From a paper:
[name] is one of the most commonly used protein expression tags due to its exceptional performance in enhancing the solubility of the target proteins. The death domain superfamily is a structural motif found in many proteins that are involved in physiological, as well as pathological processes. To explore broader crystallization space, we designed a series of protein expression vectors V28E1-V28E6 containing helical linkers of different lengths.
Indeed, both hNLRP12-[name] and hMNDA-[name], two targets that failed to crystallize using fusion proteins expressed with the V28E vector, crystallized using fusion proteins expressed with these new vectors (V28E1-V28E6). In the structures, the V28E4 linker adopts a straight α-helix connecting the last helix of [name] to the first helix of [name], whereas the V28E6 linker is slightly bent.
Author numbering: 2 to 402, 405 to 460
């Protein structure tokens, strides 16, 4: 589509898209510009595919962790808020949408997972993960269960995996080390082992997912769930009297959720960038605009200071921010999707008994490190001129060890297939050393010097 004089917006289907459509109708009334809100499945995987063809929505909403990869691939317009508009939003929310020094999206709202609990079944929720088996043994006798939440998406199990030490990529000196992946350390093993023990002891079912847990909680069948602010609307409509509180500790350490900033990026290919700017700054990021969305599904702690001051008086929002401060803002680097895919497979395989915890997590660390390295090496090879990539292949065609890389394999391979061949054949660490040295040899000392700086700590 991408037609001029219309805005198309994509937002995930668990968000308040009917409220956002109401903000779109006000824009249309005031300006004559139609706004279409859609919620495609897997919108966050479809956006990079269609935007790289010059198509897609004008505006895309997702948590900020996806946006670095979109920006690195050139799919997002840099946004240009004036100083006066920037002062309307909290400074840490602007940081979450900064990539390579540029603002690449409008931050909307700060999301963190909380422990949600049914006050009639459980007037005093647990402070610890460790007491949840004893607490479930009690509720079973009453015909209930202690805790159901989505085990299919690692976003929901990460708080526990990280509590005693798990991490995605090691952070220091303001930069993330994509070679130092923390999904296989002692603390991650301990958290996932606890989760799987909960399943093997029949306190949880490995196949619980979002809709199952949400239904069970909102029907009064389970005393607790783990969810974000978007889920409160549906509990409000049910008969459940709930509270929202800090996640349980594990081995005495806070559960550490990955905090998302819901963010609106502008497609690089859109011919409507100025209208999208006007819609986001003057209609959405206002008291009325955010109230319209929030009434549909709550946003969490919004980035807009004037509205957030009213929301911050809600103890549910107090709890959301308490959990946020116990966790960490997600990285936005392009390698975050590699981390998430690897962890997702590990948690599903351990929970279903397909693999042990130790083997699931050992494979997740290898998979994440390999995919992260592929991402970086691809990006660098894409910076070679086509004539320099040809010289590169001749250099690597002579690289020894069991067998070499045959000429026909490289002959018509582009930068991504070349990155894959090198990594498949040499492993991530050697693939990168060979490519770095080859950049020096074919006289791209700019790539050589910048690549050297990647691994310095
Ligand atoms: O094939 C496996 C699955 O692939 C797809 O899911 C991927 C995503 O494409 C990745 O982006 C990532 O997802 C992260 C996500 O980026 C991160 O923001 C967080 O998502 C929260 C969201 O912030 C929050 O607002 C609310 O919507 O809940 C989301 C979690 O459900 O965490 C996600 C990780 O859990 O990783 C997954 C792979 O796990 C695809 O969409 C799936 O349909 C597919 O099965």
């Amino acid at each position: 589509k991408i037609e001029e004089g219309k805005l198309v917006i994509w937002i995930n289907g668990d968000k308040g898209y009917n409220g956002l459509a109401e903000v779109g109708k006000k824009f249309e009334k005031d300006t004559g510009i139609k706004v279409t809100v859609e919620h495609p499945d897997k919108l966050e995987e479809k956006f990079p595919q269609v935007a790289a063809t010059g198509d897609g929505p004008d505006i895309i909403f997702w948590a900020h962790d996806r946006f670095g990869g979109y920006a690195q691939s050139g799919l997002l317009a840099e946004i240009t808020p004036a100083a006066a508009f920037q002062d309307k939003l909290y400074p840490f929310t602007w940081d979450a949408v900064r990539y390579n020094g540029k603002l690449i999206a409008y931050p909307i709202a700060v999301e963190a997972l909380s422990l949600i609990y049914n006050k009639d079944l459980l007037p005093n929720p647990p402070k610890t993960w460790e007491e949840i088996p004893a607490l479930d043994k009690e509720l079973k006798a009453k015909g209930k269960s202690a805790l159901m939440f989505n085990l299919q998406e690692p976003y929901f199990t990460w708080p526990l995996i990280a509590a005693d030490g798990g991490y995605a990529f090691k952070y220091a000196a303001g930069k993330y080390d994509i070679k130092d992946v923390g999904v296989d350390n002692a603390g991650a093993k301990a958290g996932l082992t606890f989760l799987v023990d909960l399943i093997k002891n029949k306190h949880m079912n490995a196949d619980t997912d979002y809709s199952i847990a949400e239904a069970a909680f909102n029907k009064g069948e389970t005393a607790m769930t783990i969810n974000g602010p978007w889920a409160w609307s549906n509990i409000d409509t049910s008969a459940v009297n709930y509270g929202v509180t800090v996640l349980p500790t594990f081995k005495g350490q806070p559960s550490k959720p990955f905090v998302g900033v819901l963010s609106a990026g502008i497609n690089a290919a859109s011919p409507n960038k100025e209208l999208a700017k006007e819609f986001l700054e003057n209609y959405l990021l206002t008291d009325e605009g955010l109230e319209a969305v929030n009434k549909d599904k709550p946003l969490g702690a919004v980035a807009l200071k004037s509205y957030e001051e009213e929301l911050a008086k809600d103890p549910r929002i107090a709890a959301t921010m308490e959990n946020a401060q116990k966790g960490e803002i997600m990285p936005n680097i392009p390698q975050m999707s590699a981390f998430w895919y690897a962890v997702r497979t590990a948690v599903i395989n351990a929970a279903s008994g397909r693999q042990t915890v130790d083997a699931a997590l050992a494979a997740a660390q290898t998979n994440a490190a390999r995919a992260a390295a592929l991402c970086r090496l691809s990006t660098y090879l894409e910076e070679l001129e086509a004539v320099e990539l040809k010289k590169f292949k001749l250099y690597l065609g002579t690289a020894t060890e069991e067998g070499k890389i045959p000429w026909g394999s490289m002959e018509k391979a582009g930068p991504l297939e070349m990155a894959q061949l090198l990594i498949t054949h040499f492993g991530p660490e050697e693939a990168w050393r060979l490519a770095l040295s080859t950049f020096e040899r074919i006289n791209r000392k700019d790539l050589w010097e910048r690549g050297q700086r990647e691994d310095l700590v």
